[PDB]
Swiss-Prot record, chain A:
NCBIfam families found in the cross-reference section: S20
Name under which the protein is recorded: Small ribosomal subunit protein bS20
GN (gene name): rpsT
A GO cellular-component term linked to this record: small ribosomal subunit
Ribonucleoprotein listed as a keyword: yes
Cross-referenced SUPFAM superfamilies: Ribosomal protein S20
HAMAP family assigned to the protein according to its UniProt record, in alphabetical order: Ribosomal_bS20
Molecular function as annotated in GO: small ribosomal subunit rRNA binding; structural constituent of ribosome
Region ranges (Disordered): 1-26
From Swiss-Prot, chain B:
Protein name in UniProt: Small ribosomal subunit protein uS17
Record HAMAP family: Ribosomal_uS17_B
UniProt record similarity statement: Belongs to the universal ribosomal protein uS17 family.
The keyword Chaperone belongs to this UniProt entry's keyword annotation: no
Underlying gene: rpsQ
InterPro entries xrefs: NA-bd_OB-fold, Ribosomal_uS17, Ribosomal_uS17_bact/chlr, Ribosomal_uS17_CS
Assembly and oligomerization: Part of the 30S ribosomal subunit.
GO biological process: translation
Pfam family, one: Ribosomal_S17
Database matches in Gene3D superfamilies: Nucleic acid-binding proteins (2.40.50.140)
UniProtKB/Swiss-Prot annotation, chain C:
Organism (species): Thermus thermophilus (strain ATCC BAA-163 / DSM 7039 / HB27)
Positions annotated to bind Zn(2+): C8, C11, C25, C30
Similarity comment text for this entry: Belongs to the universal ribosomal protein uS4 family.
Origin organism lineage: Bacteria, Thermotogati, Deinococcota, Deinococci, Thermales
Protein name: Small ribosomal subunit protein uS4
Keyword line: Metal-binding, Ribonucleoprotein, Ribosomal protein, RNA-binding, rRNA-binding, Zinc, Zinc-finger
Curated annotation (Swiss-Prot), chain D:
Primary gene name: rpsP
Endoplasmic reticulum found in the keyword field: no
SUBUNIT field: Part of the 30S ribosomal subunit.
Identification of the protein by name: Small ribosomal subunit protein bS16
Key word Heme present: no
Gene Ontology BP, a term: translation
Entry GO terms, CC: cytoplasm; small ribosomal subunit
Keyword terms of this UniProt record: Ribonucleoprotein, Ribosomal protein, RNA-binding, rRNA-binding
Similarity remark: Belongs to the bacterial ribosomal protein bS16 family.
GO molecular function, one term: structural constituent of ribosome
Organism, as annotated: Thermus thermophilus (strain ATCC BAA-163 / DSM 7039 / HB27)
Amino acid sequence: RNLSALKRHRQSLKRRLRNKAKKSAIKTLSKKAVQLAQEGKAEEALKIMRKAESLIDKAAKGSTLHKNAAARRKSRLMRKVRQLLEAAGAPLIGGGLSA
Amino acid sequence: PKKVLTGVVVSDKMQKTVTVLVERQFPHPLYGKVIKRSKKYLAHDPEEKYKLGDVVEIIESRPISKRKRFRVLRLVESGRMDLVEKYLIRRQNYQSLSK
Amino acid sequence: GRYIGPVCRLCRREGVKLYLKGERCYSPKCAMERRPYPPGQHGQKRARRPSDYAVRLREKQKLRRIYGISERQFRNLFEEASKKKGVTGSVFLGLLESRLDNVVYRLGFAVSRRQARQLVRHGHITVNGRRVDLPSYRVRPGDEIAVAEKSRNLELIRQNLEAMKGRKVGPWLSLDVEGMKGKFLRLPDREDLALPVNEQLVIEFYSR
Amino acid sequence: MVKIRLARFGSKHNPHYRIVVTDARRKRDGKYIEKIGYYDPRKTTPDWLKVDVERARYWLSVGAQPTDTARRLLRQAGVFRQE
RNA sequence: UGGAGAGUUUGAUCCUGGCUCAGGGUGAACGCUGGCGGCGUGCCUAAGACAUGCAAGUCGUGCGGGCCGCGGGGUUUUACUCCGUGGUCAGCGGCGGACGGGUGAGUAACGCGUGGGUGACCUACCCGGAAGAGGGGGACAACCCGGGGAAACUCGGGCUAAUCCCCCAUGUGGACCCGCCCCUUGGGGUGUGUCCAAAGGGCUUUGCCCGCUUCCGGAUGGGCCCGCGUCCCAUCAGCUAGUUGGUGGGGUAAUGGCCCACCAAGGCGACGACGGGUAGCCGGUCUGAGAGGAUGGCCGGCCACAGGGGCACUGAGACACGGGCCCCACUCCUACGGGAGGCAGCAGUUAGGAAUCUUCCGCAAUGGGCGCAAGCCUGACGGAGCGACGCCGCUUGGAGGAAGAAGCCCUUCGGGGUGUAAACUCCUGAACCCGGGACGAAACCCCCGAGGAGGGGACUGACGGUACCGGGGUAAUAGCGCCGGCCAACUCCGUGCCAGCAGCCGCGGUAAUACGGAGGGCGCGAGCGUUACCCGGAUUCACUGGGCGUAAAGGGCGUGUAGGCGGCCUGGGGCGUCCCAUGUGA
Ligand SMILES: [Mg+2]
Ligand SMILES: [Mg+2]
Ligand SMILES: [Mg+2]
Ligand SMILES: [Mg+2]
Ligand SMILES: [Mg+2]
Ligand SMILES: [Mg+2]
Ligand SMILES: [Mg+2]
Ligand SMILES: [Mg+2]
Ligand SMILES: [Mg+2]
Ligand SMILES: [Mg+2]
Ligand SMILES: [Mg+2]
Ligand SMILES: [Mg+2]
Ligand SMILES: [Mg+2]
Ligand SMILES: [Mg+2]
Ligand SMILES: [Mg+2]
Ligand SMILES: [Mg+2]
Ligand SMILES: [Mg+2]
Ligand SMILES: [Mg+2]
Ligand SMILES: [Mg+2]
Ligand SMILES: [Mg+2]
Ligand SMILES: [Mg+2]
Ligand SMILES: [Mg+2]
Ligand SMILES: [Mg+2]
Ligand SMILES: [Mg+2]
Ligand SMILES: [Mg+2]
Ligand SMILES: [Mg+2]
Ligand SMILES: [Mg+2]
Ligand SMILES: [Mg+2]
Ligand SMILES: [Mg+2]
Ligand SMILES: [Mg+2]
Ligand SMILES: [Mg+2]
Ligand SMILES: [Mg+2]
Ligand SMILES: [Mg+2]
Ligand SMILES: [Mg+2]
Ligand SMILES: [Mg+2]
Ligand SMILES: [Mg+2]
Ligand SMILES: [Mg+2]
Ligand SMILES: [Mg+2]
Ligand SMILES: [Mg+2]
Ligand SMILES: [Mg+2]
Ligand SMILES: [Mg+2]
Ligand SMILES: [Mg+2]
Ligand SMILES: [Mg+2]
Ligand SMILES: [Mg+2]
Ligand SMILES: [Mg+2]
Ligand SMILES: [Mg+2]
Ligand SMILES: [Mg+2]
Ligand SMILES: [Mg+2]
Ligand SMILES: [Mg+2]
Ligand SMILES: [Mg+2]
Ligand SMILES: [Mg+2]
Ligand SMILES: [Mg+2]
Ligand SMILES: [Mg+2]
Ligand SMILES: [Mg+2]
Ligand SMILES: [Mg+2]
Ligand SMILES: [Mg+2]
Ligand SMILES: [Mg+2]
Ligand SMILES: [Mg+2]
Ligand SMILES: [Mg+2]
Ligand SMILES: [Mg+2]
Ligand SMILES: [Mg+2]
Ligand SMILES: [Mg+2]
Ligand SMILES: [Mg+2]
Ligand SMILES: [Mg+2]
Ligand SMILES: [Mg+2]
Ligand SMILES: [Mg+2]
Ligand SMILES: [Mg+2]
Ligand SMILES: [Mg+2]
Ligand SMILES: [Mg+2]
Ligand SMILES: [Mg+2]
Ligand SMILES: [Mg+2]
Ligand SMILES: [Mg+2]
Ligand SMILES: [Mg+2]
Ligand SMILES: [Mg+2]
Ligand SMILES: [Mg+2]
Ligand SMILES: [Mg+2]
Ligand SMILES: [Mg+2]
Ligand SMILES: [Mg+2]
Ligand SMILES: [Mg+2]
Ligand SMILES: [Mg+2]
Ligand SMILES: [Mg+2]
Ligand SMILES: [Zn+2]
């Protein structure tokens, strides 16, 4: 009966978590980014937008988030960040953005 | 080559969208006599330039919406309401058919 | 295969002298010389004008019976005839002739075709070295329709050989009576043929 | 990946492969990208092989591991001989 | 290079017009009969229910152990060990389980076919080109202990490896924000800012192979998109709330109302929307002179489904038939808490049905998967098996023998027919027995060179002691339909509108070529008939090719919408139309 395709299954479980994990970090850091972004604090906003950008591409090196979806995240993320710091603020610290 | 069509614009009531009607013609598979049929296409017009009664080149395009997969290429002649006359008349004899 | 039953009997329905028998049919008795009428209780009474059917029918049954051959096979050939170019009526016949068991008759290695079939089928014949026994075997032009080694000195083989001396046969053929072997010159012209049969009437019936 | 192999054909007991470039997946007697020449295990005729070495050169060129018993008819058919 | 008609309305006639037959066709079935092979083919019904076996795994050159067999030096040896080591069965780890194989339920729709689009896209392994591989840390199974449990399994506690996880560096390069040029839908280059690499494993060591990482190209496979083609009912005529479009966002590999918030009031429809019925589509197949009609079994392509329905996880790829979770139905186990299962894979069961096979053989071939290879599994496949289901080849004999046996039919009592038919003689020699016996198989693998090109060297065949070849060798299965007309093929008896026949016209009420039996004949033969359905005949939906005074058929008459159709001459474009080339039409 026991077709050891189970190994394939047990594997997937271990997998699921591992990138579920990476993925949620994306989100929460991503939020805590746009958050501090709008609020005003820029050098802090970006400083988080940093380990943001990082954690994204990092998830890219494997089976998790991949392709240019690794990018689409950034293309919008920092895209939103800039726009908000833009609200009366200014490119305080040399964040992940070029002025 | 991205297929292209001339048909008259037949409605402008849409936001950045236009209804274009295009008679093709062809010969009946058994009866030869060239017959005429027509279809409406939902063109895109981000400049809201084209008005009613315009005759237009329409190009197969990247999908804009549920029904728009063409965009307006170029005008061919302004004043030709006489044709929309027809499309309206046709569309009005209907109301006198129901029960 | 061939209606093994009474055969000096068909000659009688068609009413034409037919050479299914060998010596005897040449004698006074193809069944026919003594009894020129059709078989059965009747047939000796005044027959009636065959409908356009009977005619096209009986003519078919003639040319078919002459080769003692499978209707399905015949029917097939008739159609193969239309498959290819030319005058169908001829090639049909021309094609009938290509039949190996028909050659061992035109080349006379036997008195009958039914006899001819036996020998062919029994491996007694051969072609270019191989012991063909397929009556069907279509003879293409130009091939040693010889006789086999174990066979050459055979009882009923010789009695037909010593009887096969001289007597010219087949303009579309050639017989090395000594070496016991013939050749297929070419495909039998219509004129080269002479059968008691109207080809044009057999085509008719094969349209129903 | 893409492949180059024998595609059986012709009746029972009468094999008659067809040496072709398919995708590895395609079933055996399947659809295929192109024909690069027949073959016969029995050699009933003097023509018991053939290969458009020209285009074969091509498919190997754009990368395309063939079968093993298909090399056996590319070598023994002269494709890798440059001298 | 291809086209036939007949019977039947009448006392008879011509015409109109139905009905009916002869033809071909099948995944066939049923009847009577049935010898041999070859290549095909075989659940059309309940996408009903399935016992048992087998259908997908593989790598010790990713890692660490449980187990087990062999061996030895080193220390005189003891304690032995480590390694070489081969085998294992599990575990982690990698690649494959999405291919292959089954079936048409659903689906009338970009599902399919066909031709294009993607500046809106991905693509494992393969191929090509560039670059790079420095250091450090950690977890969890196996295993050990403990615990619960009928079972299924499972909780905890403690170690440990790695091509598993993670971190900092180098950044060829790539991703992103913004800015510039080129380009023109999101294409290409550059600049500043940030972000992201990596894994070791082998042998014959001064080296090569299997691998890793980033990136660009290549090929192949695929997502998406559009023009056009794709069934019956108008006694279905109006349809539409994500409905149509916009703006911004979410999602994806990517476009899109695919999903959400906000706004606008749209979108569709007699050129048939909406509904209802029906159905997988195609290359093709059948039929037909052809136009046309019918059709999608087998084979190949595409689609869809895996008891019904929903779902996502892993992944380059699936929402995955032999993976997972949930509900419903169904079967089984249970220690009543619980648990297991999915043949529309091969084969086989049962059920229903007019009806559809062997629980075979083999990886030798071809193909696939993994692997450095040796090799392992491959019910794909290659074969064998059973059914005249189909097409094709073959057989049941060949020659000679009577004015012509016996029997049996008919008979004007002379005779006729079966009938060369048999008998008999001769010749041949299916079956059967003996011998020999493959092709399908030369590659991976071994030396030269260099593991390359090039040559040479060996193993391996399920089918099968079959095919085929030589020797011996026995005359050695015939059946079914019809015989009134169409329609080939006549008489005798019985029967007496009874028994029965039939496709239609009709036949049988004493003298039947129409019923049944006979002799005889006709047709065709391992087949012959019946029934069913498709095309033809049917020019009987008529484009090819029909009609409407009385045969069926002119709207009771106008007036007009849409639609269809449109005079004479010059000219522009060239939409149809035509011609040429070119891609495509697997
Ligand atoms: Mg012809
Ligand atoms: Mg000609
Ligand atoms: Mg014809
Ligand atoms: Mg009548
Ligand atoms: Mg065989
Ligand atoms: Mg079925
Ligand atoms: Mg080992
Ligand atoms: Mg070991
Ligand atoms: Mg390795
Ligand atoms: Mg071990
Ligand atoms: Mg001890
Ligand atoms: Mg130890
Ligand atoms: Mg199959
Ligand atoms: Mg099927
Ligand atoms: Mg429908
Ligand atoms: Mg469609
Ligand atoms: Mg369509
Ligand atoms: Mg397409
Ligand atoms: Mg195309
Ligand atoms: Mg360089
Ligand atoms: Mg460690
Ligand atoms: Mg370590
Ligand atoms: Mg880092
Ligand atoms: Mg640089
Ligand atoms: Mg870095
Ligand atoms: Mg780094
Ligand atoms: Mg590293
Ligand atoms: Mg790694
Ligand atoms: Mg490391
Ligand atoms: Mg070394
Ligand atoms: Mg919607
Ligand atoms: Mg509102
Ligand atoms: Mg259906
Ligand atoms: Mg159905
Ligand atoms: Mg047609
Ligand atoms: Mg159909
Ligand atoms: Mg169809
Ligand atoms: Mg089927
Ligand atoms: Mg099929
Ligand atoms: Mg099919
Ligand atoms: Mg299901
Ligand atoms: Mg089932
Ligand atoms: Mg389900
Ligand atoms: Mg699966
Ligand atoms: Mg599933
Ligand atoms: Mg299964
Ligand atoms: Mg119990
Ligand atoms: Mg019990
Ligand atoms: Mg209990
Ligand atoms: Mg239960
Ligand atoms: Mg075995
Ligand atoms: Mg194999
Ligand atoms: Mg097996
Ligand atoms: Mg039977
Ligand atoms: Mg039968
Ligand atoms: Mg007698
Ligand atoms: Mg008598
Ligand atoms: Mg005789
Ligand atoms: Mg006899
Ligand atoms: Mg005797
Ligand atoms: Mg013999
Ligand atoms: Mg021997
Ligand atoms: Mg070596
Ligand atoms: Mg033997
Ligand atoms: Mg022997
Ligand atoms: Mg055989
Ligand atoms: Mg013999
Ligand atoms: Mg008659
Ligand atoms: Mg009676
Ligand atoms: Mg009577
Ligand atoms: Mg009478
Ligand atoms: Mg009678
Ligand atoms: Mg009758
Ligand atoms: Mg018709
Ligand atoms: Mg018609
Ligand atoms: Mg007409
Ligand atoms: Mg008429
Ligand atoms: Mg009138
Ligand atoms: Mg002009
Ligand atoms: Mg001009
Ligand atoms: Mg063609
Ligand atoms: Zn005679």
